[PDB]
Write a protein that binds this ligand. Sequence first.
Ligand SMILES: *[C@@H]1O[C@H](CO)[C@@H](O)[C@H](O)[C@H]1NC(C)=O
Ligand SMILES: *[C@@H]1O[C@H](CO)[C@@H](O)[C@H](O)[C@H]1NC(C)=O
Ligand SMILES: [Mg+2]
Lengths: 174, 86
Amino acid sequence: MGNVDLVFLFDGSMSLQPDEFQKILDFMKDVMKKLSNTSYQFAAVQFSTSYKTEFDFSDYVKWKDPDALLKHVKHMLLLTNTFGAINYVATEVFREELGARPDATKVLIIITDGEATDSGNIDAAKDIIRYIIGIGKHFQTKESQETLHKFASKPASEFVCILDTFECLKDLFT
Amino acid sequence: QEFLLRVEPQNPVLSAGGSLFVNCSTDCPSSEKIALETSLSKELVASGMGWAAFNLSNVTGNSRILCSVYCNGSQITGSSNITVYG
Ligand SMILES: *[C@@H]1O[C@H](CO)[C@@H](O)[C@H](O)[C@H]1NC(C)=O
Ligand SMILES: *[C@@H]1O[C@H](CO)[C@@H](O)[C@H](O)[C@H]1NC(C)=O
Ligand SMILES: [Mg+2]
């Protein structure tokens, strides 16, 4: 298995309840704990109206502690500008200056309810494997399912799943 | 250039926990994509030029909502704090 630079792009919008946001934080911490001491290195970005890199690859290498790296997170509680968020990750997070490895396979785990308050395209992230981990009552809506298909890698059956069981992520370990 | 996004009703105070009709509108010429940001169950029930109306159901507690739309390529937002008393 080659190196993998993985970015958790998590939804901090008002549409997700406080308990759901906390479940997102706990989920990211758990996935990182299971991937400690592997070819994986991480970064996390919270998105709502704006985007915030909560910790970068260099932070992960130095701390190697998910709990410590995400403890400071404050719920944004604004809009859900997902298109811009994916672009921000593609150009502002996957950078050697922030600890990214040029040789590494780029992976994005987008934890959200699937809604989007913005538009555009994500051509800049065409070389990034994108998973959608759903949470929130809006996830199963027709609007969300149609929206998330524009973000998830194909086929959707392999890259889209729910937070409670995260079945689609188990392949990251094989 | 610079317009406002109205959220009606503004900061409503209701009881029980049924439904609420929210209308997000703007006078911005050729506005694009009106969206309502809320953790409540929502259904788009009506729309016209510069506005969109939604029906929010299962309003059991206080909840803040935000509306957005693109005016002249820029995103503007409106808010409304829903208060529920029992
Ligand atoms: C929503 O508000 C706009 C702007 O005042 C109005 O023109 C429209 O008739 C309203 N629609 C509904 C469903 O009330
Ligand atoms: C309450 O709602 C108003 C919108 O009229 C908003 O400007 C204000 O920030 C809200 N108050 C809170 C919860 O900060
Ligand atoms: Mg949202």
